[PDB]
Design a protein around this ligand. Structure first.
Ligand SMILES: *[C@@H]1O[C@H](CO)[C@@H](O)[C@H](O)[C@H]1NC(C)=O
Length: 324
């Protein structure tokens, strides 16, 4: 039981946070389990060589430090690693090779771009399940990502493109978050989402989609968020095969008309949110009125009301008799 003077130690929990450290203290107990190193001014040269030997460390909190690249020399068996609010740009295969049992990784609020990541950095990370890259400088999705991933948060980046191979192979992915990016349908590869069998949430809030994306996986897709884009259109096959989808939101978009029977595969739809769309109730909208009346009471529909013509503005599409 030897605990560094600056820090305080209690039964494997090492509290070295908020102590203006520029370096990690040398005398860490061998029975270390969780490392509280957050809220320090720690840079990459402040990690001692002996840190690697702390073989019982499973959780490390290094958020809100001064790290400018991926920390090497971390305890060989880390499982939980929180690097948010650092200045990390570079990430190399070698660095990640050092902690191959890593399971969840928080790089939120850093300065990583796709190029600042070595190609194939993750080839050994055969246990990574959670990868959070929220609020970085990514402009695309990195080609080499481990099959084991289950959650992938990429919100508020500068992503404008998504190659097919970046997402293909992620056959375990369940949640994919691309809110707050610069995506438009030109930026989408052919079947980028197509192979994500295990996908449960797709969240594309706050981009520049002008059309509902196609070739989505319908085996498990349960929630689908498309708000705050500029979607003009629903291609005929957009919601194809989504037999498990119970939630779909296209609020704050630019839809005025729906193709006939786009919602025909939505066997499990329960929540359909279309507030703030410029719905135009003409002879093209008549099928929708029917479909609404044929819809089970269970199902919750919101915002599906006429904006045009002014004549019938604000009236529920389910309740109209005559429009043209
Ligand atoms: C989906 O995930 C479950 C558990 O995460 C796994 O057993 C299954 O094999 C996955 N599906 C595919 C096609 O990999």
């Amino acid at each position: 039981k030897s605990c560094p003077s600056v820090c305080r130690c209690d039964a494997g929990f090492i509290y070295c946070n908020d102590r203006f450290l520029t370096s990690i203290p040398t005398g860490i107990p061998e029975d270390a389990t969780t490392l509280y190193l957050q809220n320090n001014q720690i840079n990459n040269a402040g990690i001692p060589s002996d840190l690697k030997n702390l073989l019982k460390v499973e959780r490390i909190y290094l958020y809100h430090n001064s790290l400018d690249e991926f920390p090497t020399n971390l305890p060989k068996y880390v499982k939980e690693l929180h690097l948010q609010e650092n200045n990390i740009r570079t990430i190399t295969y070698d660095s990640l090779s050092k902690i191959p049992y890593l399971e969840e990784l928080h790089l939120d609020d850093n300065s990583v771009s796709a190029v600042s990541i070595e190609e194939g950095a993750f080839r050994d990370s055969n246990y990574l399940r959670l990868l959070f890259l929220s609020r970085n400088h990514l402009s695309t999705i990195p080609w080499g990502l481990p099959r084991t991933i289950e959650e992938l948060r990429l919100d508020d980046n500068r992503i404008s493109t998504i190659s097919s191979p970046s997402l293909q192979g992620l056959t375990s992915l369940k949640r994919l978050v691309l809110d707050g990016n610069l995506l438009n349908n030109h930026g989408l590869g052919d079947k980028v989402f197509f192979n994500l069998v295990n996908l449960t949430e797709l969240s594309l809030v706050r981009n520049s989609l002008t059309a509902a994306p196609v070739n989505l996986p319908g085996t498990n897709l349960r929630k689908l968020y498309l708000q705050d884009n500029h979607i003009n259109r629903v291609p005929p096959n957009a919601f194809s095969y989504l037999r498990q989808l119970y939630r779909l939101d296209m609020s704050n978009n630019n839809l005025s008309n729906l193709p006939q029977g786009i919602f025909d595969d939505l066997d499990n739809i329960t929540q359909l949110i279309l507030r703030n769309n410029p719905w135009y109730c003409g002879c093209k909208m008549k099928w929708v009125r029917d479909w609404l009346q044929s819809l089970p009471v269970k199902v919750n529909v919101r915002g599906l009301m006429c904006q045009a013509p002014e004549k019938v503005r604000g009236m529920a599409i389910k309740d109209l008799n005559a429009e043209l």
